[PDB]
Amino acid sequence: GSIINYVIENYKLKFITPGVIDFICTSLIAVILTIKLFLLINQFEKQQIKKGRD
Amino acid sequence: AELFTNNALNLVIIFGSCAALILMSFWFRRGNRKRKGFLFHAVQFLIYTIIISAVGSIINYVIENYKLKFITPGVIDFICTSLIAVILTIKLFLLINQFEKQQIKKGRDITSARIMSRIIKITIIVVLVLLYGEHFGVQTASVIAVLGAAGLAVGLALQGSLSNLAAGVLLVMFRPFRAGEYVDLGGVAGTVLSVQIFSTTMRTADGKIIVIPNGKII
Amino acid sequence: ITSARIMSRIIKITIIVVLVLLYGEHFGVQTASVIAVLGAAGLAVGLALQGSLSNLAAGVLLVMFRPFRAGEYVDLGGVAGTVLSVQIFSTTMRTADGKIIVIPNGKII
Ligand SMILES: CCCCCCCCCCCC
Ligand SMILES: CCCCCCCCCCCC
Ligand SMILES: CCCCCCCCCCCC
Ligand SMILES: CCCCCCCCCCCC
Ligand SMILES: CCCCCCCCCCCC
Numbered sequence: 123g124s125i126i127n128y129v130i131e132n133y134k135l136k137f138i139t140p141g142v143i144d145f146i147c148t149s150l151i152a153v154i155l156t157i158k159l160f161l162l163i164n165q166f167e168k169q170q171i172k173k174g175r176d
Numbered sequence: 177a178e179l180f181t182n183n184a185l186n187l188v189i190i191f192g193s194c195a196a197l198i199l200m201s202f203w204f205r206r207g208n209r210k211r212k213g214f215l216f217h218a219v220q221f222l223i224y225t226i227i228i229s230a231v232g233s234i235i236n237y238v239i240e241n242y243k244l245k246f247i248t249p250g251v252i253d254f255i256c257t258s259l260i261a262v263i264l265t266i267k268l269f270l271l272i273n274q275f276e277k278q279q280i281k282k283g284r285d286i287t288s289a290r291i292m293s294r295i296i297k298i299t300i301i302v303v304l305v306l307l308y309g310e311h312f313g314v315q316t317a318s319v320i321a322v323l324g325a326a327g328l329a330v331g332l333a334l335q336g337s338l339s340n341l342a343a344g345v346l347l348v349m350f351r352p353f354r355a356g357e358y359v360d361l362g363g364v365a366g367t368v369l370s371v372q373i374f375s376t377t378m379r380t381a382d383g384k385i386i387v388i389p390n391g392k393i394i
Numbered sequence: 395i396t397s398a399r400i401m402s403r404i405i406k407i408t409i410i411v412v413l414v415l416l417y418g419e420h421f422g423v424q425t426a427s428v429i430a431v432l433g434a435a436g437l438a439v440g441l442a443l444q445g446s447l448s449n450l451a452a453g454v455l456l457v458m459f460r461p462f463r464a465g466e467y468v469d470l471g472g473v474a475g476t477v478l479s480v481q482i483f484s485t486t487m488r489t490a491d492g493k494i495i496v497i498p499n500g501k502i503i
């Protein structure tokens with residue numbers, strides 16, 4: 123993502139602004155954090171139900 | 177001339193943002209396959225704000241371009257963020273009012289639901305000033321200290337209810353007793369009818385209902 | 395008149411205190427020692443108002459969750475009687491003897 127950021131530092135011709143890319147790059151990874159982190163909690167709940175908990 | 181070379185990306189989202197609203201807006205008109213809730217409303221507000229940011233700031237850049245117009249950059253930025261804040265209040269008040277209507281329908285008393293709505297209105301307004309304390313009006317060190325003192329006072333007042341909530345969570349997780357089990361919770365004995373968030377209801381052998389806060393039980 | 399006069403004075407004092415907060419820097423001066431002393435005063439006031447805030451929260455809870463309603467015989471910790479009304483800070487019950495008892499909501503909760 124920052125490789126493309128540097129690619130842009132290079133070809134400034136593209137109207138693409140550095141700020142948006144940095145905002146998107148870190149924003150995208152955050153989303154994966156939620157989706158990835160929610161799965162484990164849901165998986166943990168499934169095991170808890172299996173163990174015998176109400 | 178030499179300014180459209182930077183607006184191209186901005187116009188891309190503007191057109192996409194404008195089309196995004198139509199797709200989601202017409203979906204609500206055409207029934208509701210997914211749960212309505214407040215998630216869709218937040219997206220609507222979240223998509224609407226981008227248009228203001230995209231095109232409000234699009235016009236901001238338009239001005240960075242034609243400085244001829246006496247229009248000053250500061251006012252536009254103040255108006256752009258100020259306008260979106262107003263939509264936040266109008267949009268956010270509707271859901272709370274809608275929630276109150278459902279509560280009345282469910283069976284809750286008018287005063288029971290009316291009091292609940294007022295509590296949300298006061299808390300929502302307090303949060304709104306926090307998010308726009310600097311932009312709107314002013315926020316000084318004395319103001320911050322007084323607001324922190326008020327928050328501390330509120331937190332100290334709500335100590336009992338939070339303690340009861342924590343005790344109820346613990347009683348739900350660890351089960352020293354269950355609904356239908358004779359128990360003696362500190363001088364009171366009776367069949368347990370139900371464990372709730374703040375208190376549990378037991379029916380003594382005599383036949384009377386007793387409600388005990390969860391914190392005292394724990 | 396004294397009931398309303400006292401209420402007006404309380405608003406005057408609080409409104410003035412807020413006015414200096416909003417113009418402490420522009421008008422006069424606002425130093426770090428001044429900020430610390432004002433924060434200490436606010437903390438003292440908040441600690442003093444702990445009981446009233448607790449009663450308010452308890453009353454809100456009693457209004458939301460209804461362990462009892464106006465006209466229901468109850469026993470709120472050693473006192474029993476028909477419940478006449480639940481208010482913000484306290485509720486009024488009338489014992490079977492015929493006397494009125496007022497109990498703070500926090501103690502009830
Ligand atoms: C440079 C920013 C200074 C902010 C000062 C905040 C002071 C908060 C005092 C809180 C007292 C309870
Ligand atoms: C009706 C009362 C609503 C709650 C008001 C709380 C005020 C706290 C002031 C603390 C000052 C340090
Ligand atoms: C000073 C404000 C403190 C507010 C604390 C709120 C805690 C809410 C816990 C969840 C309740 C269901
Ligand atoms: C309002 C606070 C709710 C959470 C209370 C603490 C629960 C901790 C459980 C720990 C189990 C190992
Ligand atoms: C640069 C701003 C410094 C502000 C310092 C505030 C100190 C507050 C102390 C509060 C003690 C209770």
Ligand SMILES: CCCCCCCCCCCC
Nearest residue numbers: 295334337447450451454455
């Ligand atoms: C002065 C404080 C008023 C609010 C008291 C807390 C009410 C929490 C209700 C939570 C219901 C789930």
